[PDB]
CSV table of C-alpha atoms in Angstrom, one decimal:
chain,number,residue,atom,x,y,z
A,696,UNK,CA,-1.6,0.0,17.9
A,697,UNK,CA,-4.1,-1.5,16.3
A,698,UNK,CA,-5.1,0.3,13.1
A,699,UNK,CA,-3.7,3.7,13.3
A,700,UNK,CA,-6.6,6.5,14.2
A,701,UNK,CA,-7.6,9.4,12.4
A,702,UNK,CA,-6.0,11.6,14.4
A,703,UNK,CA,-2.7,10.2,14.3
A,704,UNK,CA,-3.3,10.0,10.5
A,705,UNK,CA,-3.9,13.7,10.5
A,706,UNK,CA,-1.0,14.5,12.1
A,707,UNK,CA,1.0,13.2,9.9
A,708,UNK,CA,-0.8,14.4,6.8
A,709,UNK,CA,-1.5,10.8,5.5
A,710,UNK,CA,-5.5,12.3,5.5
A,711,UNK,CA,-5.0,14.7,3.2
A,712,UNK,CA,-2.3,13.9,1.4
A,713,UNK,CA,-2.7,9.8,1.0
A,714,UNK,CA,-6.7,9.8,1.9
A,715,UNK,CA,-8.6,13.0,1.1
A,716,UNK,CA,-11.0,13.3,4.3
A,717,UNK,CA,-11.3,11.4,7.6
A,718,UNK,CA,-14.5,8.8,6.4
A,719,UNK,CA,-12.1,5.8,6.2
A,720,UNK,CA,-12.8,2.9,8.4
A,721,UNK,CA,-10.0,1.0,9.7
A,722,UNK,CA,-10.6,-1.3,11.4
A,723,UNK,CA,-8.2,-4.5,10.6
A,724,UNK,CA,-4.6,-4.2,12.0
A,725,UNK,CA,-1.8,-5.3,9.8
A,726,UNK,CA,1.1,-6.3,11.0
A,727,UNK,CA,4.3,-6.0,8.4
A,728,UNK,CA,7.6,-7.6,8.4
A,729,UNK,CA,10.4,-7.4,5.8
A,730,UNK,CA,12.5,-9.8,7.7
A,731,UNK,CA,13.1,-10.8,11.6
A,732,UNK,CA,13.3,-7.1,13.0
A,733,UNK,CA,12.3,-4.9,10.5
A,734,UNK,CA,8.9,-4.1,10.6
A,735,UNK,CA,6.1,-1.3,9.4
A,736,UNK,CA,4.9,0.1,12.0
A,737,UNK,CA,3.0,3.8,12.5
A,738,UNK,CA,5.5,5.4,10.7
A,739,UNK,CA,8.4,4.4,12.7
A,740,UNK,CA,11.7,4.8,10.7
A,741,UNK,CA,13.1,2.2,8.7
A,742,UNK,CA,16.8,1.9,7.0
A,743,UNK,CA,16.3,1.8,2.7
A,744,UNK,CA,19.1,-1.4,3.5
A,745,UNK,CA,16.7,-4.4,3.5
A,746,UNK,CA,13.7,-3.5,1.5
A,747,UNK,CA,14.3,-4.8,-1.5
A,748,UNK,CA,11.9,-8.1,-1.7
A,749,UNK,CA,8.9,-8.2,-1.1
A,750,UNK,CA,7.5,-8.6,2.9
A,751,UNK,CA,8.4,-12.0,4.1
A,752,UNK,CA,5.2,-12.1,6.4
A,753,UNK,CA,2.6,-10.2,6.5
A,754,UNK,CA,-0.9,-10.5,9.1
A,755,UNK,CA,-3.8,-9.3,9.6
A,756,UNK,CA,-6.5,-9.2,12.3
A,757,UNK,CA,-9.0,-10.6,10.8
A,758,UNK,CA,-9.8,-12.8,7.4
A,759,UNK,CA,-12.1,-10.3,5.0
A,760,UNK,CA,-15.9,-11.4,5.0
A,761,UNK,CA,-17.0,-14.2,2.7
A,762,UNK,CA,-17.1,-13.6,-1.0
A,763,UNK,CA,-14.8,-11.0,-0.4
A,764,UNK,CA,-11.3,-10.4,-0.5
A,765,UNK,CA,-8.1,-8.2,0.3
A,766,UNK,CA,-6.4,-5.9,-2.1
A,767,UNK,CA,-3.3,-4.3,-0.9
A,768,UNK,CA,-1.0,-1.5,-2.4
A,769,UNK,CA,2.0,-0.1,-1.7
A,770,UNK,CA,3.0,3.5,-2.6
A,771,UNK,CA,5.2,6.4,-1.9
A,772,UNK,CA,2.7,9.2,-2.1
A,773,UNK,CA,6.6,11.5,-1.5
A,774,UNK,CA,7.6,10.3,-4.7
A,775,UNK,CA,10.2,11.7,-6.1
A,776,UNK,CA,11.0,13.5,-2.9
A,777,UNK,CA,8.7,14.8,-0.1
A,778,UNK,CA,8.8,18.7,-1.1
A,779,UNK,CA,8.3,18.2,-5.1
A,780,UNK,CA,5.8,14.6,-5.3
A,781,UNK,CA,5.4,15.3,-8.8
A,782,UNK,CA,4.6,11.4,-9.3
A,783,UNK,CA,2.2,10.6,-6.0
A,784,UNK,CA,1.3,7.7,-5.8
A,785,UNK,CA,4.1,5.7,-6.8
A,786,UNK,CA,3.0,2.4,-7.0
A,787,UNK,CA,5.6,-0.5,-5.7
A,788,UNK,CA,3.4,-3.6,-5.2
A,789,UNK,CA,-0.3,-4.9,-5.7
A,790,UNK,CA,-2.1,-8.2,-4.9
A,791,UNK,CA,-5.4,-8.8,-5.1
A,792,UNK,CA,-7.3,-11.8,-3.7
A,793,UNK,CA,-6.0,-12.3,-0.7
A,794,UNK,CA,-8.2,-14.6,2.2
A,795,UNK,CA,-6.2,-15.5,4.9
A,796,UNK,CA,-5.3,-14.0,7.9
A,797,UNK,CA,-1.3,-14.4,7.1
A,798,UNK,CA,0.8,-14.1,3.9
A,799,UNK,CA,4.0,-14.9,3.3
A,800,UNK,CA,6.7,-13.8,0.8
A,801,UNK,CA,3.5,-11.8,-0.7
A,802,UNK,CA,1.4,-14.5,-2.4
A,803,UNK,CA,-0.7,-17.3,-1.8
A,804,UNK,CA,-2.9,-19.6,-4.4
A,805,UNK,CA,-5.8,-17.1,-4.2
A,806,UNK,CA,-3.6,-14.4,-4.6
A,807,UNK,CA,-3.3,-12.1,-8.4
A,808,UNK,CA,-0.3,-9.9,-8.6
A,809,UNK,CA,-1.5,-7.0,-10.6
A,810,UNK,CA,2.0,-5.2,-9.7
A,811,UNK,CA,4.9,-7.3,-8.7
A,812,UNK,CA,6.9,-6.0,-5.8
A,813,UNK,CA,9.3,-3.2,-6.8
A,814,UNK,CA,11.4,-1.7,-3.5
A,815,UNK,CA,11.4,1.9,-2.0
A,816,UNK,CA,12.3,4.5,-5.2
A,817,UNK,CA,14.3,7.0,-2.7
A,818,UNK,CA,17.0,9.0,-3.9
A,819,UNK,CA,19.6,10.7,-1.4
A,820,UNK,CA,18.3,14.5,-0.5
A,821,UNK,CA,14.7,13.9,-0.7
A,822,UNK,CA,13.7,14.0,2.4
A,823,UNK,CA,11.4,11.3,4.4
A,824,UNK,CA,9.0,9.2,2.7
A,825,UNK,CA,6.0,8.2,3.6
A,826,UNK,CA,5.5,4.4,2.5
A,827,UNK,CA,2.3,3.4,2.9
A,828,UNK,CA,0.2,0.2,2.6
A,829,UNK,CA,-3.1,0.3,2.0
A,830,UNK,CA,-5.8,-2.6,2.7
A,831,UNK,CA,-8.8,-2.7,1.3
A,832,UNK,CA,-11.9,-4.9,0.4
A,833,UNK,CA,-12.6,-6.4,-3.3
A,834,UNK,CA,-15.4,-8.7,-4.6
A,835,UNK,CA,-14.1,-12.1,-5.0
A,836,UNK,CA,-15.7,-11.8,-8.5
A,837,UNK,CA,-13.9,-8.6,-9.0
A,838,UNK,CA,-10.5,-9.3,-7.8
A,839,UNK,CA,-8.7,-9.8,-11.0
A,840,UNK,CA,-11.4,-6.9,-12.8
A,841,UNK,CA,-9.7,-3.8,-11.2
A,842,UNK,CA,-10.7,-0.9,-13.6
A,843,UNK,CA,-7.1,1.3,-13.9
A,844,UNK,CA,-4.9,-1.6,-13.0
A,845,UNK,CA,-4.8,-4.3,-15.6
A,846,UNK,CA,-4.1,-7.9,-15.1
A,847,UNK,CA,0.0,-8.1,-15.2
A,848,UNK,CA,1.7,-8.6,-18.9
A,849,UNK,CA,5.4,-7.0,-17.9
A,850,UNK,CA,6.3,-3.1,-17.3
A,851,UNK,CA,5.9,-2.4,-20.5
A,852,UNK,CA,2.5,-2.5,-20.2
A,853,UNK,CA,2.0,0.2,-17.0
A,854,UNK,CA,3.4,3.1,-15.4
A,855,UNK,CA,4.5,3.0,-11.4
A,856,UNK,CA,4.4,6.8,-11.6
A,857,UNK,CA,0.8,8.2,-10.7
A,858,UNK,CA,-0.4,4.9,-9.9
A,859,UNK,CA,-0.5,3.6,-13.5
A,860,UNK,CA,-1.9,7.4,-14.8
A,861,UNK,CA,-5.0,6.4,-12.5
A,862,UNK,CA,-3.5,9.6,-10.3
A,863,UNK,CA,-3.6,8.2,-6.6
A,864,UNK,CA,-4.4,4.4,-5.1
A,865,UNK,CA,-7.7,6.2,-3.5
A,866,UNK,CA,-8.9,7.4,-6.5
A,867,UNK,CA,-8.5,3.4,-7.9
A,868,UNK,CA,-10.3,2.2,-4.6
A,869,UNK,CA,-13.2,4.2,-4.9
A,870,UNK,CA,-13.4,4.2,-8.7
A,871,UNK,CA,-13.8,0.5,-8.2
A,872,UNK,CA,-16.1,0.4,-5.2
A,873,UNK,CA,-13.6,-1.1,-2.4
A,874,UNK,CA,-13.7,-0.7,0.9
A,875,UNK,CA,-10.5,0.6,3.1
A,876,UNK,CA,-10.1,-1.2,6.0
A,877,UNK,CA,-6.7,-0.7,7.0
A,878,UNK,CA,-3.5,1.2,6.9
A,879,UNK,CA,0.4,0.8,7.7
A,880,UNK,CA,3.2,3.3,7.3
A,881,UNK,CA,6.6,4.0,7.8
A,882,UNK,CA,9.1,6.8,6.9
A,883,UNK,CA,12.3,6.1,5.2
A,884,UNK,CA,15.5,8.1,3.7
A,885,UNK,CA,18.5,7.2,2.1
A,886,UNK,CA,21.8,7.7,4.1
């Protein structure tokens, strides 16, 4: 639509809920395709089928400013279902050091996966979830320095539930002093 607005995030409860208040500044549209056809796009619905790897191609707007890079999550914040999130954020996926306007297959040579790609957690009778991708800014310095989520070493080594017990991807973004800039969602059940 470009980046969704406030108001349409309000509506749909993504401020509160995903971001506390309505200070967040999007401004860089991302577009996100799992494959030809199935994209993320303003909470339009999409089938569980599909979503198992990792976005083949992903773009944004703009490149982020120099000495600085993208970070992006993904989360269910309806995790286990949308009427008892008892573990919001879940945490499927997050890369850090992105600097290019396009990724594909969810890396690059700039790129540090702190979280490798895990697909949608959604049980049948939980209701719609909210899957959300969050974009935000990261020192280039910083980008493998994120206080919370610790360079990779295997699942042993963190929790998906709660966002790695760091409670909520905002509370890691402002924690470490990045910038949101943008925002997609979608809703998805399982038949």
């Amino acid at each position: 639509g470009g980046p969704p607005t406030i108001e349409e995030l309000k509506r749909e409860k993504i401020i509160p809920h995903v971001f506390p208040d309505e200070n967040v500044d999007l401004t860089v549209d991302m577009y996100i395709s799992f494959k030809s056809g199935k994209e993320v796009n303003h909470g339009n619905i999409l089938d569980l089928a599909g979503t198992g790897s990792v976005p083949r191609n992903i773009k944004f707007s703009e490149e982020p400013p120099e000495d600085y890079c993208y970070i992006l999550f993904m989360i269910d914040p309806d995790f286990p279902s949308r009427r008892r999130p008892d573990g919001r954020d879940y945490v499927h996926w997050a890369v850090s050091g992105i600097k290019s306007k396009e990724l594909v297959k969810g890396t690059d040579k700039n790129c540090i996966t702190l979280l490798p790609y895990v697909g949608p957690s959604i049980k049948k009778g939980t209701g719609l979830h909210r899957i959300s991708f969050i974009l935000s800014l990261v020192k280039e310095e910083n980008k493998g320095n994120v206080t919370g989520v610790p360079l990779y070493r295997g699942e042993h080594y963190i929790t998906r539930v709660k966002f790695n017990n760091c409670q909520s991807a905002y509370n890691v973004i402002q924690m470490n002093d990045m910038k949101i800039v943008g925002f997609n969602w979608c809703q998805m059940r399982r038949k």
